[PDB]
Amino acid sequence: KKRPEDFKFGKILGEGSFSTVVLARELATSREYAIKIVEKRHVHKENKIPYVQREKDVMSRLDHPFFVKLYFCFQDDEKLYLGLSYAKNGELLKYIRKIGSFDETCTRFYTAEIVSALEYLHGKGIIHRDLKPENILLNEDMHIQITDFGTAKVLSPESKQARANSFVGTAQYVSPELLTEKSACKSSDLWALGCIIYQLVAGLPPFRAGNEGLIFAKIIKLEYDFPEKFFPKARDLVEKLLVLDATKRLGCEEMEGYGPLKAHPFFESVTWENLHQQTPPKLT
Ligand SMILES: Nc1ncnc2c1ncn2[C@@H]1O[C@H](COP(=O)(O)OP(=O)(O)OP(=O)(O)O)[C@@H](O)[C@H]1O
Numbered sequence: 154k155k156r157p158e159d160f161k162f163g164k165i166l167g168e169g170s171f172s173t174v175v176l177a178r179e180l181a182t183s184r185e186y187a188i189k190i191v192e193k194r195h196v197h198k199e200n201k202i203p204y205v206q207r208e209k210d211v212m213s214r215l216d217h218p219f220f221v222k223l224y225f226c227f228q229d230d231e232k233l234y235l236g237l238s239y240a241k242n243g244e245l246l247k248y249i250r251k252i253g254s255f256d257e258t259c260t261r262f263y264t265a266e267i268v269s270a271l272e273y274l275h276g277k278g279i280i281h282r283d284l285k286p287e288n289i290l291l292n293e294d295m296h297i298q299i300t301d302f303g304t305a306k307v308l309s310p311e312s313k314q315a316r317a318n319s320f321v322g323t324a325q326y327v328s329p330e331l332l333t334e335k336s337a338c339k340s341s342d343l344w345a346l347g348c349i350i351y352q353l354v355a356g357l358p359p360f361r362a363g364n365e366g367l368i369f370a371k372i373i374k375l376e377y378d379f380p381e382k383f384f385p386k387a388r389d390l391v392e393k394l395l396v397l398d399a400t401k402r403l404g405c406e407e408m409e410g411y412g413p414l415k416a417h418p419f420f421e422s423v424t425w426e427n428l429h430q431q432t433p434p435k436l437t
């Protein structure tokens with residue numbers, strides 16, 4: 154087990170409502186890590202322990218190039234530490250906001266990586282439940298690094314569990330089924346995927362309003378529009394993901410999974426193998 158004095162801390166990378174992520178160098182290796190730190194008193198006081206434990210447990214299960222890797226964990230008398238790969242280029246949302254929207258080649262490439270990641274995650278019987286540009290980081294090579302697994306769910310294989318009951322998510326990306334049926338499924342992530350593709354091309358997510366309730370009302374009514382100029386095959390893909398019936402979204406188990414999704418005409422030119430070894434297109 155590593156200790157805090159095994160590291161030299163540098164700048165703070167960001168701060169959550171009960172966590173701090175700090176850039177750290179390991180003295181014995183000179184390796185860089187992003188260390189997530191929570192105060193035991195705070196999580197003990199604010200009933201956050203199940204989230205801490207969840208994040209650890211879920212990240213321990215992941216072994217794939219498009220996720221933030223968990224390398225190690227430790228604790229002292231005041232804090233819990235999560236040793237993570239450092240995503241040098243930060244959040245995808247930053248780039249969306251900076252350039253306003255992605256061209257077709259970039260939209261295709263980053264959508265393909267997110268599909269690849271979700272194929273992996275769902276293959277392991279895990280639902281993310283809070284997929285959004287803020288939670289998709291970018292490494293030094295500008296490949297994606299999905300994060301934020303404290304609100305993920307490992308579905309039980311023993312019971313062939315399909316639905317998750319905890320109420321979690323972000324209003325702009327939350328699925329109609331969690332709102333109306335009060336449970337989420339793997340396909341709830343595909344709804345988020347549709348929202349993100351939309352956002353990449355249009356510059357904003359499709360259901361938006363100045364408070365959550367209004368957004369909820371738009372979601373359950375499928376109330377949204379495409380801007381006049383939206384890549385047509387991408388619009389078709391979005392219309393196949395933003396479907397109220399969760400059993401009818403392209404990529405869901407009832408539609409026979411990721412095969413048909415990866416075969417969508419929007420991905421015609423994609424080479425799905427060793428995606429993580431291709432040079433990403435420049436966002437420019
Ligand atoms: N592995 C990482 N590499 C680089 N930056 C990271 C990494 N992990 C997190 N960050 C950055 O640090 C910020 C804070 O992360 P953290 O998970 O502690 O809180 P959060 O999830 O943003 O906040 P909240 O809990 O309120 O949602 C993130 O928003 C992200 O921008």
Ligand SMILES: O=C(O)/C=C(/CCc1ccc(Cl)cc1)c1ccc(-c2ccccc2)cc1
Nearest residue numbers: 189191193205208209226227228233234235
């Ligand atoms: O690492 C270890 O060896 C052990 C643990 C479990 C120990 C533990 C003891 C008391 C409390 Cl209140 C919470 C966790 C641990 C440590 C860190 C995290 C962690 C998870 C997410 C963010 C930051 C830290 C989770 C469990």
